[PDB]
Structure formats: structure tokens, C-alpha cells
Swiss-Prot record, chains C, G, J:
Compartments it resides in: Virion
Organism name: Human rhinovirus 14 (HRV-14)
Function noted in UniProt: Lies on the inner surface of the capsid shell. After binding to the host receptor, the capsid undergoes conformational changes. Capsid protein VP4 is released, Capsid protein VP1 N-terminus is externalized, and together, they shape a pore in the host membrane through which the viral genome is translocated into the host cell cytoplasm.
Protein name in UniProt: Capsid protein VP4
Subunit (UniProt): Interacts with capsid protein VP1 and capsid protein VP3.
Post-translational modification, as annotated: Myristoylation is required during RNA encapsidation and formation of the mature virus particle.
Length: 255, 236, 40, 273, 273, 59, 40, 57, 59, 40
């Protein structure tokens, strides 16, 4: 009586149940694991807070309306302030982590709409100015708020044009990245497990984000007659196999 | 001193030849490799992942909406969409498949075309997808369409339908850039019965459509893509 | 025959002949069998 | 290898063509799941789509130019193109760039070919024979200031001398600092509020300075340098969506404003053929 | 091997020299069936009549020309012969063409040799040294528009750079779409009422674009390109009647009107020697 | 570096010589051969088929 | 010795030494013996 | 080859970090004598610092 | 005479290449080596000897 | 393969792979053990 459909994920002191899942994706078919010695470089023993950092943090909720263009969060940024995960983050020189991402959106059998939930490794954004204008730090570190693709261009911020993925590629091809759809008629959640993907064994958690999670409405939300025209979307994310190394004074970052 | 003779071609530089060269950095030790998920070995590995087709090309500036094929409730007998199968041009051209095919001169193989339905769960519909092999015109009505490769799709719990365009061909390779002799057919879709919405519901519903290549597929003779060009060198 | 001492100086590599699209085409956690229902 | 097996009529409870794309998988459906097929063999291996093959041919990566002329009274050799440097890149001419950016991280050895041809746009009695010197200047080395500085001694820095009209060829091991070169980097060099975004040393491949060794003749001679780059021993990870809009800058993803629709509009209906 | 066996007088009921040609056979009659012969050996193998040998020597297949000159103010490089393309063919110069069309389908690898020589028809101080670039442009690739377009980057398209006066040589595998190249094709590309007859992609071998890499000197330089083609690994099917009338077009069988009698008229009688 | 000497004829192009060359299309896979009746191997095979002689040349 | 990797790059092929004119000189359905009458 | 071995807390009478430089020696002290380390390998031979290489271009 | 083809790079001088050369002094016999204390093999050997740092740079 | 007769004409030597800093880092007459007191 197991269905692909019902699932339970327990991680730390927190549990999620979905009764309307559509399997789960594990990026590149690899599950998060700690850093092996053969791959290690820094000689420091690392710190593995385990259950105090590897639990589920639910970010603040978004509201899908007929005019929504899509939202974008960066990792580990989105979690920069969650509990002890965040403290560890500002206090060590280097850290490394994988995540379980669970995006939630329920409706009824009269609604229609379909969101794309995708994880993009190394999502370098484009400046809407063109040329070689850079995208300032603050703009690519929105924190739990994430970036709202239907917000206005700002100065020093990225471009927010959806048919171009914020980088000069077409929305249609985002499907080459680990992703899952939430089609109100099928699905009510999306779950993706992200292994740590980098060109170095461990890195800085503040100067470099290693994935952007993106939720994009593709088939517009259509509510039943005289229904309220909107649904909330909630994102809950859990660091998994986290390791921190090179402890010290506590980083100070712009803004 | 051993006697030699040099042949025609001596001193030429062929950008495609593969020979040994002296290393400028004798004895240098590269950084160790660490493990990174995701290694690609063949472009054939990636063109099997499906991506969305902007089938609804009828707009005037690129929009999220050209990915949406609309469906109308209560129409009978009528046609949902049509396209030829020049995978290197037209709707296909910006898709990952289209985009890679363009790095090669010839392609052969089967294509997989699927449609995912997004209408309310309490609605229902039966569509027919038809592949018309080279030699006939794009079908003009379902009767015409239904006499070639087709699948009656019944919209249900299972949200997507995967149609295969089996390789139908005299010549074993076709050109990726559209060519007549080498042309592959048409793909059309019609109401088999009709879309029906539940009460309290209204308007258009949309289908999303994807394209990817079957394991069947072959691409050969690499060349340059018409999809990118430039007028002055870029700088930092 | 390599005429040179360093590995960078050798010619092109030889075909992976690796090829495994499943990391890209089927990264699902619970295995899907073709023919069995997608969602149970 | 069979490309298609033989398959006949089906009337089952087992439907391989109905799936749920919401799952993120592309189910491996074949012609034989939905029509009746006959056996056929592949006759093909997929040799020429190997990434080593795809990135393994020489591409032009840079065209520069230097001239041989009397430096007498020139206050700025660099500025007179008496000599010229180039910080190596693979993202300035777009053909090879789009190919590499199909991947996120890439690792390979480089084989460089340098073609140099001379031009004599104004009245010369003859064509002189010039020798070019190409010096590889790694970050931290003294940089040439005049076309005949102590720098050119290049006692510790690899340099090649070849003749204009000829070609020079040598190969450099993978010089990246990390395990792969980042084709993309969503980071900064530090948490500064105004530091540059995206451009990184993670990509840095050295830099190269060119000059003519010859002193000047009575006429002036323009020498134009073309650098070709061939990847050998390629390793690529994490495929990405191909580049759709035009490029504007080395190292940023930025596209131009008021660009044009990249998807071709139908001449007709959705229903059109 | 015996070329003739010894044979003596015959008075038989078994007549090998009477046959019925209406049958379509050529009965294998020998000298020894009708005169008295002596033994003799062949001393010969028929080596130099092998089709590999017959089609295996280089033949000139194309002569084109490009010039190096100041492109300043040229609105159409292609038109100034600043650069030039060629869609590969083996039926434009007739010598090799008649040889190939002795067969209906032919399959082979090609070895190309390209000789480039320069001419300076009007007053120059000297002869410059130019490097030619020959790019192989398969159907669907961007085609060069100016003599120095992004196209020439040729990041994915094989190109060779050699010096004028020298020769370039490389070999291309059999690039046909079918199993053989059609020397003839009695068909159309589709059932159109006005589509072209006979000319087909079944024959298509690619196409090639040439340019000088050098910028301009003070004088102008004419470079004339000659492409030679040698078939290697030849396979030929279905022999046909040799070409009798002159050729008029690449790819059609058409002969010129009011052509001249191709059979030499006797100077004398049927009875004449 | 192995010492060599080049002989007279170096650099010449003889249309009849038979040597190896680099392939411009590294790794390309040609179309499979299928069977076709009629293969010719030697011109000596075909000159044994008889054909008509315009003997009456007097026109 | 081939110095190159691809087959197209090898020199000319070597003599068929096949030679069988009968597909061209005697494509008759019922075999004709020299010396026996052509038409029986 | 290990570049660093794994080493944990220490509370000893054996102090490798106190020395007398007046002796003229450079005592071979390592990270693992004064912090807690994890194993890591060298992955490197020191090829390009050989004097033959240094004076050989 | 063995057929050859020369590749791109022929005739170049790369200051970092390592090949054989004819000896200008054929048959000459170098002075015997005697023992000398102090041989260095790697620069890695010497950067492990400590030296003083002008830390007080303020002059 | 050496093509030449004299030893000076051969290419560069090959890595010492000798490496022993103690003549430079620990030339003390009485051996010092790390961890034992420097001056007893």
C-alpha cells in the first residue's frame, strides 16, 4: 500500500509528511555524503553539529497569484539566519552541506496551475544593465526573502526576466537541471535532495552560493469560480551532512 | 643522418588533427581531481533528457506563454496544433535537442514527443496525436491524420503521454538544417472526443509539450551552429 | 609512442565509451519501472 | 547492437506510454512501445559526440597585433603596439565559448597554435623576416614595459620564438587552482559590498606577451597574431541550458537590453505546418 | 597462368562458335575454339585496371581565385573575391567526371590536395607571403559574409591554414548520406511539379570557403586555388555506357543542341580498309 | 632530436603517389554499406561484355 | 604502419584480385554450355 | 603520502612546540603538534622545484 | 628515403623544451667530481630552514 | 634513444627525488628529539 504518493522525511527533530508527492529527485543521482580524506585539503578537523543543523527550516511563505513571475532563493544564503545553522556559517572560515528541499502548494480538484521547481548549480546571474555591469553582493544575497522575479529592476541588482533564467538561457531548457513540477491536478509538493557540488572540497559559505532553488509558475494559476484568486507556496529546506571548518572570529558581511 | 622526403601538406595547420606537442611547463603538477556529481561523457547522454518546446510560437516577443498549448472545452473533431518535423528549425530550434542537433550535420533516430496535461483534476479529455511520414501533406482533418502513426491519449491520473516518432526513412540519415529530400513528416493533434470542464470552472486549460531523443539516435559530422555569432571580440 | 615526457603533451584522449544518461534522465529516489503506473 | 527489436500487436494492462512528467524523469520510451517494429541494428557508436571530440579541435581564441617600427621617441611602447599582452581567456570570441558553457566545470590540458602573418600596408621595398617572441607571463612575474626590457630575458618564464608566417605550437597542462575550471561562479572574491561578481581567478589560465625580436627596417610592418586553442584530455561536469541571447562581456552572463525575440514566430497559426 | 592452351584440328558435332546473342550472354569463346593454338602464359595480373587504381590518382576538380587587397569601402567581400566558397563536386571539370560516370553508385574516401600560387599582375615591390585558410563548411553552418567574420573562428568546423606556393593535404571519410554516392538519380526531392530533376543531395560532399589571412600590403595579390581529389578505398556498382556527347551542366545528363556526329564517318565504303 | 637529411623531391606533389593523410573529420562514422547487385572490380571484367560496332560508318 | 587513427586516412586499397565477369557476361537464368546448342 | 595525520586533544609533559633556536636547528614542527588535524594526502612530489628543473630552461 | 610530413611548430625555439644536441667538444673529458659538503637537490629542501622576518618594518 | 655519442648531448636529467633537508635544518652535533626539552 506504499504509494509513490505518500512520504515521510524525518531529519533531526523535525518531520514532514506529504500525502500527494510525485516521487523525489536526487540530483545527478547522488545523495549528500561527508567529505572524504582522499579529497581533503585543509588540515583542520571539521565540526559536524549533526542534528542541531540538519533539521528542516521553513522559510516565510510566498503568494502565487495570476500575475506571479517566479521566485529565486540561493543556498546557503536562504538559511544564513536559521538557528545554529546560521551561527556556524558566520563563525567558520569554510563549511560544506547538501540539502533536502521540500516545496509545498495545495489547492483543490477544481484549480489548475503548474510550477517548475528546479535546482541550478552555480547560477551566475546577469546584470539588467548589459555590458559588464556587475550584480552587487546584497542583490545576490536576498536571505530568506529570496528574489521576486516580478519585482522591479533595481540598480546593482540582477535582471528578473523569466524567459531567460536570469542569465541568457531559455526557460524551456531548465529541465536539463534536477527539477520536479507541482501540477495542482497531480502533485502538491516537490522534493529534491541536493548533494554538495563544487570544484573545491569545501568553500566559503558567505562569498559563494552553490545552488539557486527556483520556483516558477509555468501554467498560470486558475482558480474555480469566485474562488480567491491566489494560493500560498511554502519552501522548507534542511541542511544535510553539514560540516564546518576553520573556526574563529565571525564574519562581517556587507549590508 | 637518416634520409627523408617531405610530402604535400608539410607545415599545414589543420584545426582537427591530433598530435603530440612539447609541454611549456615541464614538470608541473596539476591539482588533484576531487569527485563532482554530474559528469557528462557524450552529448548523446544529454539529448535524452526532455525539455519543453515553445510550440505556441504565435507571440510577438518571447514569452512564457509560447510554451503553453491551449485547449478549448466542448470543441469536437477539431485540431489542437500542427508543426513539421525540422528538428533544426522552427519550434524545435531552441530546445536542448534542437540546440545540439545544430552542432552536427546529419541525424538519424527516433524522437520522443510527450504532452503533460495541466487542467483541473475533475475535467477529462481524449486527444489523438498523429505522426505523418514524409510523402503526404500535413493532415487537414483527423480522418486524414488518423491514417498514419497515432496514439489516442486518455487524460487521467497519469498526467503525461509519450508519443514516439519512429524513424521512418528511405535514406539512413537526414540533414539537421531543413532539406526537402531529407524531410521527416508532420506532427498534428486533434480532439478525439473533447475537453470537458467540471462545474464552477472555466476557460482554457493548457498542455505542456516536451522533446527528447530515443536511445536510437545518431548525430554525425560536427559543424558550427547558426545559433550564435558576434561582431567584435568581447572584453572584460 | 610518446616522444615527450609530460602527460599534457600527449594527443587527444580516446572515447569514453562510458555513456550513462540515467543520472540526467532518471534521478528519481524510488525507481520507476516502464509499464508500471507512474503514481501508485 | 539492436536499434529496434521486432515487436507485434499489444492489448495489455501494462502501458509504458502513460507517465507522470511531474516526477522529473524522462522515461525511456521506444518506438516499439507504441507501434509494431522489425529488427534493425545501430551500425553506430556515438564516437563523434564524445566530449573529448566535441571540445578537441582548435578554435580561434584571440587575434591581436603588434608592429615593428622605430621606437625612437615612443613614450609608451605598449601603446604603440611595439609589444602586446593578452590575459588568456576562452570567452572573448563566442564560437568556442558557447560550446564550453554547455557544462559548469571543465578540466583539460590546452594545446595552443599561434599563427602570425605580416602586412605592409604602405610602400615597402620588401617583406622583412621577423621573429616573434611569445612569453607566458604567470601572475606575479614582472610585466614588460618596453619592447626590449630585462623581462624579455625570460630566464624562468617559458617563451617560444618563431617566424612570422610560421606557426608555433606547444601545450600547457591544466593550470587551474581548483579541481576544474569554473565555467560559472555565483560568488565574489570576498564579502565586499562593491567587489566584482562572477569573474573569478577560478578560471585564470595565465597570460601571454608578444613582441618582434627584430630591430626596425626602413618601412613599418604590421604583424597580426592569432591564438588557437584545442582542449585535450577533457572532463566536463553538470550540463546546463545552452546560451540563447548574445554575449556582452568576458565573464559575465549579461545579455544586451532590447535584444530580439530568440524564438522564431510562426508565419500562421499554432495549427500551421 | 595459361593465356592459351595448345589445341589441334577439330571435326566435331560440338560447335562452340555458333551462339544466339539474343539471349543477352557474351559466350566465353577463345582463340583455341576456332584455330590451332600453342601454349602461352599470361605473365600479367590486371593490376592497373583495378577500380581502386583507375579512380585512385589525384585529378584537378576545381580552380577558384581570391585576392588580398584593401577591403576598405568594399560592400561585398564575396563579390570582390576577398574570400570565396566552392560546393564540392566531381562533375565540373570533365576528365574525372567521365571516369566516375562509368559506374552508377560509387563509394570512397577522398584525399584532397590544394595548391595555391600567387600572381602580381601589376607593379609590386615584392611578393608577399600570404597564408590561405580553407574552411570545410557543412550544410547548416553559418557561411562567411566578410573576409573576417566570426565564421572564420571555425571553432567546430575543420579548417586548414597553409602558405600560398605550398600545398595542403588532408583526407575526408565518405560523407554520403546513403550507402553510396549516386552518379545518377532518376528522381526528384519530392513530388513537386516544378522541382529540379536529377540534381540530388545523394551526391553532396560538403562545401569549402577560402580566404587569405593576411591584411593588405600596398599592392594587390591574386591567389588562384586548385583543388585536386583522389579517391581511396573505392567501391563501384553497375557499369554503364561511357559518355559520348559533351557535358553542359553539373548534375544533369543534358548534352548540347546541334552537337556533332560522334561516330567518325568512313573516308570510303563500308568495304574500305 | 633525431638527425635527418631531405632528398631531392621533397615537397613535390605527384598526382599518382599513395600515402597517409590526417582525416579532417576525426571520429565520424560513415553510413553502413547495404548490398547492391552489380559490383565492378576490374575494367577487365566489363570489356568482356560485347557491344555493337557502328560498322556502317558511311552516314 | 598507420600513423593516424581514422581509417579514411590510410593509403589506397590493394587489388581486389576479385574479378568475375559472369554477372555481366552471362546473366542468363538457365546455364549455357559452350559447345552445346544455344537454343534447344 | 600523508600531508597531515589525524591528531586529537593533547595534555602532555611532552611539548614539541617549545624549542631553543640558539642551537641553529629548525625543528620539524607540524600543524598536528599544536591543533587537532584530520588526515589529508599530499598528491604532489615536488618535481618542479628540483634544481635540474630550476636551472634547466 | 622515408616519407615525412612536418607539423605546426616546426622550427620554433621553446626555452622550456628538453632535447638532445650535438656536443661542440667531441670527446672531451670533464674534471673528476670531488666530494663537497652541502649539495642541494630541491628548493623544497632549503625553504624549511628558518630565517628572520623584518617584522618591524616601520623604519 | 641517444642519437649522439657524448654525454653532454643528452637531455635534461630526471628528478633527484633525493631530498634531505637535515643537512640544512638540523646540523646539530647532539641529536635533538622533538618533544624532549631543547636544553637539558
Amino acid at each position: 500500500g506504499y504509494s509513490d504518493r505518500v512520504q515521510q522525511i524525518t531529519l533531526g527533530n523535525s518531520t514532514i509528511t506529504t500525502q500527494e508527492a510525485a516521487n523525489a529527485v536526487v540530483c545527478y543521482a547522488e545523495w549528500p555524503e561527508y567529505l572524504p580524506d582522499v579529497d581533503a585539503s585543509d588540515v583542520n578537523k571539521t565540526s559536524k553539529p549533526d542534528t542541531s543543523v540538519c533539521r528542516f527550516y521553513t522559510l516565510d511563505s510566498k503568494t502565487w497569484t495570476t500575475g506571479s513571475k517566479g521566485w529565486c532563493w540561493k543556498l546557503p544564503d536562504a538559511l544564513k539566519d536559521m538557528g545554529v545553522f546560521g551561527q556556524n556559517m558566520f563563525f567558520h572560515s569554510l563549511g560544506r552541506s547538501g540539502y533536502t528541499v521540500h516545496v509545498q502548494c495545495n489547492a483543490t480538484k477544481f484549480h489548475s496551475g503548474c510550477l517548475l521547481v528546479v535546482v541550478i548549480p552555480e547560477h551566475q546571474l546577469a546584470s539588467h544593465e548589459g555590458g559588464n555591469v556587475s550584480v552587487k553582493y546584497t542583490f545576490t544575497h536576498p536571505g530568506e526573502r529570496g528574489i521576486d522575479l516580478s519585482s522591479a529592476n533595481e540598480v546593482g541588482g540582477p535582471v528578473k526576466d523569466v524567459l531567460y533564467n536570469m542569465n541568457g538561457t531559455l526557460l524551456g531548457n531548465l529541465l536539463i537541471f534536477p527539477h520536479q513540477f507541482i501540477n495542482l491536478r497531480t502533485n502538491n509538493t516537490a522534493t529534491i535532495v541536493i548533494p554538495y557540488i563544487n570544484s573545491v572540497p569545501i568553500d566559503s559559505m558567505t562569498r559563494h552560493n552553490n545552488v539557486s532553488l527556483m520556483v516558477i509558475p509555468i501554467a498560470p494559476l486558475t482558480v474555480p469560480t469566485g474562488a480567491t484568486p491566489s494560493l500560498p507556496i511554502t519552501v522548507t529546506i534542511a541542511p544535510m551532512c553539514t560540516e564546518f571548518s576553520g573556526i574563529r572570529s565571525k564574519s562581517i558581511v556587507p549590508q | 643522418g637518416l634520409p627523408t622526403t617531405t610530402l604535400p601538406g608539410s607545415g599545414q595547420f589543420l584545426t582537427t588533427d591530433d598530435r603530440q606537442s612539447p609541454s611549456a611547463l615541464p614538470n608541473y603538477e596539476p591539482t588533484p581531481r576531487i569527485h563532482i556529481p554530474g559528469k557528462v561523457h557524450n552529448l548523446l547522454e544529454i539529448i535524452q533528457v526532455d525539455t519543453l518546446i515553445p510550440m505556441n510560437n504565435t507571440h510577438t516577443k518571447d514569452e512564457v506563454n509560447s510554451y503553453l498549448i491551449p485547449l478549448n472545452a466542448n470543441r469536437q473533431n477539431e485540431q489542437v496544433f500542427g508543426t513539421n518535423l525540422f528538428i533544426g528549425d522552427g519550434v524545435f530550434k531552441t530546445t536542448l535537442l534542437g540546440e545540439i542537433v545544430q552542432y552536427y550535420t546529419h541525424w538519424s533516430g527516433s524522437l520522443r514527443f510527450s504532452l503533460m496535461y495541466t487542467g483541473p483534476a475533475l475535467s477529462s479529455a481524449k486527444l489523438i496525436l498523429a505522426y505523418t511520414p514524409p510523402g503526404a501533406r500535413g493532415p487537414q482533418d483527423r480522418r486524414e491524420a488518423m491514417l498514419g502513426t497515432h496514439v489516442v491519449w486518455d487524460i487521467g491520473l497519469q498526467s503525461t503521454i509519450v508519443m514516439t516518432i519512429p524513424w521512418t526513412s528511405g535514406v539512413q540519415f537526414r540533414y539537421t538544417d531543413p532539406d526537402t529530400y531529407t524531410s521527416a513528416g508532420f506532427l498534428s493533434c486533434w480532439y478525439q472526443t473533447s475537453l470537458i470542464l467540471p462545474p464552477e470552472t472555466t476557460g482554457q486549460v493548457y498542455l505542456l509539450s516536451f522533446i527528447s531523443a530515443c536511445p536510437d539516435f545518431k548525430l554525425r559530422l560536427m559543424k558550427d551552429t547558426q545559433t550564435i555569432s558576434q561582431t567584435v571580440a568581447l572584453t572584460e | 609512442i610518446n616522444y615527450y615526457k609530460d602527460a599534457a603533451s600527449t594527443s587527444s584522449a580516446g572515447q569514453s565509451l562510458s555513456m550513462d544518461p540515467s543520472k540526467f534522465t532518471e534521478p528519481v529516489k524510488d525507481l520507476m519501472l516502464k509499464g508500471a503506473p507512474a503514481l501508485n | 547492437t539492436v536499434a529496434s527489436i521486432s515487436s507485434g500487436p499489444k492489448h495489455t494492462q501494462k502501458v509504458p506510454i502513460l507517465t507522470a512528467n511531474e516526477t522529473g524523469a524522462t522515461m525511456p520510451v521506444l518506438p516499439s512501445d507504441s507501434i509494431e517494429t522489425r529488427t534493425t541494428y545501430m551500425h553506430f557508436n556515438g564516437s563523434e559526440t564524445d566530449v573529448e571530440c566535441f571540445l578537441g579541435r582548435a578554435a580561434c581564441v584571440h587575434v591581436t597585433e603588434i608592429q615593428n617600427k622605430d621606437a625612437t621617441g615612443i613614450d609608451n611602447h605598449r601603446e604603440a603596439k611595439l609589444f602586446n599582452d593578452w590575459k588568456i581567456n576562452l570567452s572573448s570570441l563566442v564560437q568556442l565559448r558557447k560550446k564550453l558553457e554547455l557544462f559548469t566545470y571543465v578540466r583539460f590540458d590546452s594545446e595552443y597554435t599561434i599563427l602570425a602573418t605580416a602586412s605592409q600596408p604602405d610602400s615597402a621595398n620588401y617583406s622583412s623576416n621577423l621573429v616573434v617572441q611569445a612569453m607566458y607571463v604567470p601572475p606575479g612575474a614582472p610585466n614588460p614595459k618596453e619592447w626590449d626590457d630585462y623581462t624579455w630575458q625570460s630566464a624562468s618564464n617559458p617563451s617560444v620564438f618563431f617566424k612570422v608566417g610560421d606557426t608555433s605550437r606547444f601545450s600547457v597542462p591544466y593550470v587551474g587552482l581548483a579541481s576544474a575550471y569554473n565555467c560559472f561562479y555565483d560568488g565574489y572574491s570576498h564579502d565586499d559590498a562593491e567587489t566584482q561578481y562572477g569573474i573569478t581567478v577560478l578560471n585564470h589560465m595565465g597570460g601571454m606577451a608578444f613582441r618582434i625580436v627584430n630591430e626596425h627596417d626602413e618601412h613599418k610592418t604590421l604583424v597580426k597574431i592569432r591564438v588557437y586553442h584545442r582542449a585535450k584530455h577533457v572532463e566536463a561536469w553538470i550540463p546546463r541550458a545552452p546560451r540563447a541571447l548574445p554575449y556582452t562581456s568576458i565573464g559575465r552572463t549579461n545579455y544586451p537590453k532590447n535584444t530580439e525575440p530568440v524564438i522564431k514566430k510562426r508565419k500562421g497559426d499554432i495549427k500551421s505546418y
